[PDB]
Ligand binder design. Structure first.
Ligand SMILES: O=C(O)[C@@H]1C[C@@H](O)CN1
Length: 266
């Protein structure tokens, strides 16, 4: 393997200030094709772990793949990913959540403004927002294929009071989100901080804070927007399983600290 990757001090500062950071071209075309093929397999065989877009039935997401797929199990331990998660969370880490979110060409939904941590705190018993997500770009992310859109520095407020809607956890994965940020709060945020939709080539990784507000629009391009999202959590920040409400394929219960893939002959 290559000497474990880490972010420069400038990159770390940028991540801390803005709440997100893109590394371009982390994975090459052949690597991304391997991940795309495995994603397709998970969409086909994932069963109850799969979600479909309402009004289309097109497969939208699949969850918990690193528990069921050897490829994705290895991916979360990649020397391209694990060392940076450790660096940013300043701890050993484990995977809280794994999901693949596809927005096909000419498809896609408006994803309501939200903070991930609100879900993890209330649904899963995550005590603090000492977690982040790595979004691997299976496709080039552009202005026009429904990029994750953020309020830069919007995580600095911490967790924001949100409109709650629905019972259970069914609507934690849907177009209509259980925890959504209202018109008023978002106006103030954006007036103060603005909006940014990070772009990048296929194989890029977008790191973003558990508490950063984000949203996305439909894909009006003729090109898909597949993302593999790995949520790393600090081991010290392990969720309180006694307040947990969701299956392990949404919220992990094995808090064993991850170690990196080492090079083998097979
Ligand atoms: O419910 C969850 O855990 C994730 C967090 C947000 O991305 C929305 N769905």
């Amino acid at each position: 393997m290559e000497p474990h990757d880490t972010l420069s001090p400038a990159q770390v500062d940028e991540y801390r200030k803005n709440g997100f950071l893109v590394q371009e071209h982390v994975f090459d075309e052949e690597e991304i094709e391997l991940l795309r093929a495995e994603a397709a397999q998970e969409f086909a065989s994932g069963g109850e772990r799969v979600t479909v877009e309402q009004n289309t039935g097109i497969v939208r997401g699949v969850h918990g793949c690193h528990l069921y797929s050897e490829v994705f199990g290895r991916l979360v331990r990649s020397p391209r990913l694990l060392p940076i998660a450790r660096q940013l969370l300043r701890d050993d880490v484990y995977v809280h959540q794994f999901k693949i979110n596809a927005k096909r060409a000419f498809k896609g939904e408006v994803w309501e403004w939200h903070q991930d941590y609100t879900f993890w705190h209330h649904e899963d018993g995550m005590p603090a927002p000492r977690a982040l997500s790595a979004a691997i770009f299976l496709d080039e992310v552009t202005e026009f294929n429904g990029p994750l859109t953020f309020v830069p520095g919007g995580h600095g407020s911490g967790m924001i009071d949100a409109d709650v809607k629905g019972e259970g956890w069914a609507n934690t994965l849907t177009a209509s989100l259980k925890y959504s940020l209202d018109v008023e709060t978002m106006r103030g945020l954006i007036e103060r901080n603005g909006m940014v939709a990070p772009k990048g080539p296929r194989g890029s990784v977008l790191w973003f804070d558990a508490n950063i507000p984000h949203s996305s629009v439909p894909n009006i391009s003729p090109f898909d927007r597949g993302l593999v999202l790995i949520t790393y959590n600090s081991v010290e920040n392990k969720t309180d399983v006694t307040r947990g409400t969701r299956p392990e394929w949404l919220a992990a219960r094995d808090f064993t600290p991850l170690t990196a893939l080492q090079a083998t002959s097979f």
